[PDB]
Amino acid sequence: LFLAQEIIRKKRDGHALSDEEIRFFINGIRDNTISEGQIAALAMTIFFHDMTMPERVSLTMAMRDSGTVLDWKSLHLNGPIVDKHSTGGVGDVTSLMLGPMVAACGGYIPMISGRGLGHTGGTLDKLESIPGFDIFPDDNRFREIIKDVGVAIIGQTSSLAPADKRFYATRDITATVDSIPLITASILAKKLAEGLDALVMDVKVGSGAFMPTYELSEALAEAIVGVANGAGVRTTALLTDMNQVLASSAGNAVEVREAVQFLTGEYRNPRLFDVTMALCVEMLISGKLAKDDAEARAKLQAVLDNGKAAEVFGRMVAAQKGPTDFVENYAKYLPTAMLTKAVYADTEGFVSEMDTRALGMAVVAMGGGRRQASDTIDYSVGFTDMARLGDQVDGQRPLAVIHAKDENNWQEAAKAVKAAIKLADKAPESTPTVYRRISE
Amino acid sequence: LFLAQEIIRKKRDGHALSDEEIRFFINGIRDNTISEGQIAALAMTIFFHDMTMPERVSLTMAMRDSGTVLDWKSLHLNGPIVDKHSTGGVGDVTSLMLGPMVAACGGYIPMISGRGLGHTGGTLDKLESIPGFDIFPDDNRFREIIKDVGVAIIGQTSSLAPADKRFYATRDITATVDSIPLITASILAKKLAEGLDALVMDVKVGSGAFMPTYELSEALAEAIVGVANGAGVRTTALLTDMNQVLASSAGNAVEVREAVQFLTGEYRNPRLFDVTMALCVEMLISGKLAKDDAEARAKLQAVLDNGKAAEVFGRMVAAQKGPTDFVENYAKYLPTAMLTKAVYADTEGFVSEMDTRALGMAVVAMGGGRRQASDTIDYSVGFTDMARLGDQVDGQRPLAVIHAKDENNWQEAAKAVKAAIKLADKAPESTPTVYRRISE
């Protein structure tokens, strides 16, 4: 129906908005006919009245259909269209391994990513530290890589969920961003555009988590499962730990390198391994590529050990303009910094605390990302050989190994790192890597 | 404190905003630094959390101080600075008589009016049907008229309560206009700028009332008394009837004429008389010009009968550039329409119902006001000899006498009037003119 004022009022007076009404409002948001104030007002009424399951699904759908919705029916692929989604994290490089691994098991992953300006090391920028990697293939080319290779990590060709652009921008300045119904629809809008069959949300918990409390991370996880499954996509979610860096490194080139050494068994961080394996099992199960966890973990460990996984990564990289021999000779292609020195904590002890966001911002500030846009990322700067909680430190074990441009910013970051990692006289109680699985 | 987002959140989470915080927000509204969405958001949080008495007063004060606040201390006047405020109505010409009457009793009335674009026949346009009437005297000239004459009805020299400009505009399209705390502060902002000592709100009740229900008109009346008196101005309010036209005419020239025949006792509509007397008694009492109702009604009836009141009207008109003999020879100065014919209802009976808003819009539509701004009011068009509820009608008594430009718009209005006044086989139950007096 018509009138933005009309719609705002209904919801304000504790009523449920119709699909036609929610759809009308969202397009108006996209077509710039519905003002900022009209957006901020509706967001608030939702913050006080919430939205029923039907309203929740209609909001998401009307946002998905705001832009373009991919369809792979014509391609007649012989496998499930699946993909994973995270709420971000520092060292969260699971996507580079996840994509190849699941494609090597019969799954098609049309990973339309979107970096993460603000304070989030998107994967798109990591993949750009690979000489020639084109993250912008046209539709027809993209459709080809998927069918041929199985995976493809590309940047959003804008027209995905446009309404979310204005809706989110307003919410950020009007104090209505922390509203579960709105968040749920915002996150899934982009993904549900990919024309998926199944999905898996990786909801982080802890200091570096999106939601403030475990109870709130869990809350969001349950909401996501509901509307996605309501929208037709077999979804499950996991609560991953993010109280420290996931991989043994944070940056761009250093992370893509880590993803290669993982795929080839040259080195595998155990925590990164658990989360990586846990997400893939879900995708296989949701995708029907396995009847149970045991079957799935089996197939995955195989592909990971017979080199078939790293092979797919290598085929994905080449099809997107990277070297055709990236996995074998990556050390000659990836950018190496001028200064690489290890940093040590002031005293001997056990790592008991760590501010992920701090380390995250330490990376950006040293060139690892962009605070504005005009900034140009130094794809070689970052951290490696990161200390894990519980690790005893001293002259034998530094906190991390810093890859900086010069002795100055090295020194800067060195102080940043040392300030972000808290020591203690004794090792803290351990926490799980994968807390639990929300489903149905 | 800083941040509009910060402030919005606090209030959203059921907290009380500080004076410094409310003040910061309001100036930002004025200085265009606080966006539409940030205004619409805060308005909603208030619609759901209301505002404590302290917050209520701080909002109004921060809005008053948004612009200029008059001060009459330097003038050293020998009387109270008072003024009345209405929520509008059709035929509500009480201000033209009220101003003179109270000044003739020792009260100073710096009536900064402001017409009423939209659907409200402001007094400013009525006073402009008087040849040469200048409603825009400069401060020094204005200050002179007050001290010399005692009264002065002038248009707002913009810089009064600027914040209210943007705040109200946003609210109108975001469904947050019907919020008592916001209304209370909006109305009083303009008035409290006049540097008053006492005030009296004329809150209408009925079909032509601002608030939807008697219980809501009363609700607003109690709120107004609270924050005004909290802000230092001795305030009381009355619930006037507005289920029909107050004066025996609606328009511009026809109303100013009515106000003159009242002041000179040539004719006095009894309902208009009661409301006019009721409001003045309040001003005298609040102003300290009387110890009780009896004393006040006495002084007023005197000034009304010894011609001293009409004298003041005459001195006000002349000081503001109108004729120096307007009261004695008004019939030669006021605009007279080309067509003046009486309209009769289709059948004999008793006037039982009447849509004030309809008659109000009938006047505008015939040139009595402006729907846009570029329109130029025909200060001669309007209704006179209006039927009162309970009046029996037939060939002896028409519904009203229409002053139109031509036979066309006369005919138009004639249908408008006839459609707005409902007849019945028997006279309806009478209602009071003045329902009750809210105080303290």
Give the three-class secondary structure for A284.
helix
Per the domain annotation, does A40 fall within a domain?
A: yes
The span from the CA of B15 to the CA of B10, in Å, is 5
Which chain B residues have a beta carbon less than 8 Å from that of A174?
Answer: 5, 8, 37-38, 40-41
Check whether residue A218 and residue A137 sit in a common domain. Answer: yes
B226/B93 same-domain check: yes
Do the chains contact at A173 and B4, CB–CB below 8 Å?
Answer: yes
Distance CA B170, CA B36 (A): 6
- CATH number of residue B14's parent domain: 1.20.970.10
Among the residues of A201-328, which ranges form H helices? 214-230, 253-263, 270-287, 293-305, 308-319
Whole-angstrom CA distances from B145 to B72, B102, B151, B292, B318 are 13, 15, 7, 29, 10
The total of structural domains in chain B comes to: 3
H helix or E strand, kind and range, residue A393: strand A392-393
Tell me how many degrees the CA angle A271-A275-A278 measures, rounded to the nearest 5: 135
- Do A130 and A231 lie in one domain? The reply is yes
Residue of chain A with shortest Cα separation from B12: A175
Dist CA B150 CA B312 (whole Å) = 8
HSE-up (13 A, CA, CB side) for residue A150: 21
Active site residue A123: yes
Across the interface, whether the CB atoms of A36 and B41 are under 8 A apart is answered no
Active site includes A13?
no
Query: Among candidates A155, A146, A167, which has minimal Cα distance to A44?
Result: A167
Closest CA to A93 of A271, A236, A349: A271
- Quick check: A317 and A135 in contact, CB under 8 A? no
Total Cβ atoms within 10 A of residue B324: 11
Residue B26 CA, chain-centre distance (Å), reads 25
B316: Cβ contacts below 8 Å, ≥ 6 apart = B99, B100, B103, B145, B149, B150, B151, B152, B153
**Spatial contact of B247 and B95, defined as CB atoms under 8 Å apart:** no
> Got the DSSP string for B238-252?
EEEE-SS-SSSEESS
Distance from CA of B6 to the nearest CA of A (A): 8
Is B91 found in the same domain as B105?
yes
Of B288, B311, B336, which residue is a domain's last?
Answer: B336
What are the φ/ψ torsions at residue B322 (nearest 5 degrees)?
A: -90, 180
Contact across the interface for B40 and A36, Cβ inside 8 Å: yes
Task: Give the pairing of strands B434-438 and B234-241.
Answer: antiparallel
Residues B331 and A72: their CA atoms lie apart, in Å, by: 84
Q: Which residue in B16, B73, B74, B8 sits closest to B36, CA to CA?
A: B8
> Resolution limit in angstroms?
3.0
Say yes or no: A350 and A328 in one domain.
no
Neighboring chain A residues of B48 at a CB cutoff of 8 Å: 44, 48
- Write out the two tokens for A195: 């024309």
Residue B41 to residue A9, Cβ atoms within 8 A: no
**Cα A272 to Cα A81, A355, A388, A410, distances in angstroms:** 24, 18, 12, 26
Does residue A111 sit in helix, strand or coil?
A: strand
Catalytic residue, from A123, A184, A380, A384: name it: A123
Pair of tokens at residue B167? 């705040």
Q: Inspect the interface and report whether the beta carbons of B175 and A8 lie closer than 8 Å.
A: yes
B47 contacts in chain A (CB < 8 Å): 12
Residues of B with a known catalytic role: 83-86, 123, 171, 186, 190-191
Q: Distance (Å, rounded) from C-alpha B351 to C-alpha B349?
A: 7
Beta strand B109-113 with A339-343: parallel, antiparallel or unpaired? unpaired
Q: How far apart are CA A155 and CA A125, in angstroms?
A: 10
Q: Which of B37, B43, B48 sits opposite A36 (nearest CB)?
A: B37
Residues sharing a CB contact under 8 Å with residue A178, sequence separation 6 or more, in sequence order: none
For strand B198-205 and strand B82-86, is the pairing parallel, antiparallel, or unpaired?
parallel
Instruction: Reply yes or no on whether A186 is catalytic.
Output: yes
From the list B407, B121, B382, B340, the residue with the least C-alpha distance to B253 is B382
- The nearest alpha carbon in chain A to B3 belongs to A173
Q: How far is A162 from chain B (nearest CA, A)?
A: 19
Alpha-carbon span B359 to B243, nearest angstrom: 12
Does residue A438 sit within a domain?
Answer: no
Instruction: Give backbone dihedrals phi and psi of B434, rounded to 5 degrees, phi first.
Output: -115, 110
CATH of the domain at B254: 3.40.1030.10
Domain termination residue (choose one: A301, A336, A371):
A336
Continuous H helices in A288-395:
293-305, 308-319, 356-363
CA–CA dist A309, B126 (Å, integer) = 86
3-state secondary structure of B355: coil
Asked if A175 and B5 come within 8 Å (Cβ–Cβ), the reply is: yes
Residues in a beta bridge with A427: none
Interchain contact, A41 vs B12, CB within 8 Å? no
Provide the edge-to-edge strand list for the sheet that holds B339-343.
Answer: B249-250, B382-384, B400-404, B339-343
A362, exposed or middle or buried, with CB in 10 Å at 0-12, 13-18, 19+?
Answer: buried
Chain A residues bordering chain B (beta-carbon distance below 8 Å): 4-5, 8-9, 12, 35-41, 43-45, 47-48, 170, 172-176
C-alpha A302, offset from chain centre: 25
| Parallel/antiparallel/unpaired status of strands B151-155 and B109-113 | parallel
B36, B47, B175 member nearest A36 (Cβ): B36
> CA A325 to CA A340: how far, in whole Å?
26
Solved how? Answer: X-ray
What's the CA gap between B153 and A309, in Å, rounded? 86
Nearest residue of B to residue A173, measured between CA atoms: B5
Tokens of B166: 């943007």
Give the closest-approach CA distance of A57 to chain B in angstroms: 24
Smallest Cβ–Cβ distance between B175 and the set A12, A35, A47 belongs to: A12
Q: How far is B278 from chain A (nearest CA, A)?
A: 38
- Residue A370 annotated among the catalytic residues of the structure: no
Contacts of B166 in chain A (CB under 8 A): none
Minimal CA–CA distance to A18: which of A67, A60, A54? A54
B440 belongs to a structural domain: no
Q: Determine the residue type at A307.
A: G
B12–A37 C-beta distance less than 8 A:
no
If 0-12 CB within 10 Å is exposed, 13-18 middle and 19+ buried, where does residue A71 land?
exposed
How distant is the Cα of A105 from the closest Cα of chain B, in angstroms? Answer: 48
Active site residue A207: no
3-class state of residue A151 by DSSP: strand
Angstrom CA distances, A185 to A50, A56, A63, A287, B131, stand at: 13, 7, 8, 22, 64
Residues A329 and A350 grouped into a single domain = no
Query: Has residue A205 been placed in a domain?
Result: yes
Token output for B383: 């209704």
Residue A418 CA: distances (Å) to CA of A27, A87, A90, A113, A414:
49, 26, 16, 32, 6
Instruction: Identify whether A126 is a catalytic site residue.
Output: no
Does residue A14 sit in the same domain as residue A101?
no
- Candidates B38, B44, B175; nearest CB to A5: B175
Q: Is the distance from CB of B10 to CB of B3 less than 8 angstroms? A: no
Given A172, A193, A214, the domain boundary residue is A193
CB A290 within 8 A of CB A198: no
Please report whether residue B439 resides in a domain. Answer: no
CB contact under 8 A, A174 and B48: no
Same domain, B65 and B84: no
Q: How many CA atoms lie within 13 A of B114 on its CB side?
A: 16
Nearest CA in chain B to A170: B37
Helix (H, G, I), strand (E, B) or coil at A244: coil
Write out the two tokens for B410. Answer: 């006369």
Q: How many CB pairs under 8 A join A and B?
A: 73
Strand locations in B121-215 (E): 151-155, 198-205
A84 is catalytic: yes
Q: For residue A16, what is the DSSP state?
A: P
Q: Do residues B44 and B135 share a domain?
A: no
Grouping H, G, I as helix, E, B as strand and the rest as coil, residue B412 is: helix
Same domain, B358 and B301: no
Count Cβ neighbours within 10 Å for each residue of A314-330 and write b for 16 or more, e otherwise: bbbbbbbebbeebbeeb
CA distance linking residue B63 with residue A346, whole number of Å: 56
Range of the domain at A347: 337-433
Does residue A439 lie in a domain region? Answer: no
Confirm if A182 and A55 have CB atoms less than 8 A apart. Answer: no
Chain A positions touching B9 (Cβ under 8 A) are 175
What CATH number is given to the structural domain containing A355? 3.90.1170.30
Asked if A43's CB is within 8 angstroms of B175's CB, the reply is no
Q: What region does B367 belong to: left with phi over 0, alpha with psi -120 to 50, or beta?
A: left
Q: 3-class SS at A397? A: strand
CA dihedral in degrees (B216, B222, B225, B229; nearest 10)?
-140
In whole angstroms, what is the distance from residue B141 CA to residue B143 CA? 5
Sign of the Cα torsion B300, B301, B307, B313 reads: positive
Q: How far apart are CA B408 and CA A160, in angstroms?
A: 58
Does A147 share its domain with A169? no
- Is residue B42 within 8 Å of residue B11, measured between CB atoms? yes
For residues A374 and A379, what is the distance between their CA atoms, to the nearest angstrom? 15
The tokens of B437 are what?
């007096």
Q: Which chain A residues touch B168 with a CB distance below 8 Å?
A: none
Contact state of A173 with B35 under an 8 Å Cβ cutoff: yes
Side-chain half-sphere CA neighbours of A162 within 13 A = 15
Tell me the C-alpha distance between A316 and A53, whole Å.
39
A171 and A147 share one domain: no
Domain membership of residue A440 (yes or no) is no
Residue B438 lies in a domain: no
DSSP string, B258-316: HHHHHHTTS---HHHHHHHHHHHHHHHHHHTS-SSHHHHHHHHHHHHHSSHHHHHHHHH
Yes or no, beta carbons of A40 and B40 under 8 Å apart:
yes
| No. of helices (H) and no. of strands (E), chain A | 16, 13
Buried b (16+ CB within 10 A) or exposed e, B227-253: bbbbbebbbbbbbbbbbbbbbbbbbbb
CB A122 within 8 A of CB A130: no
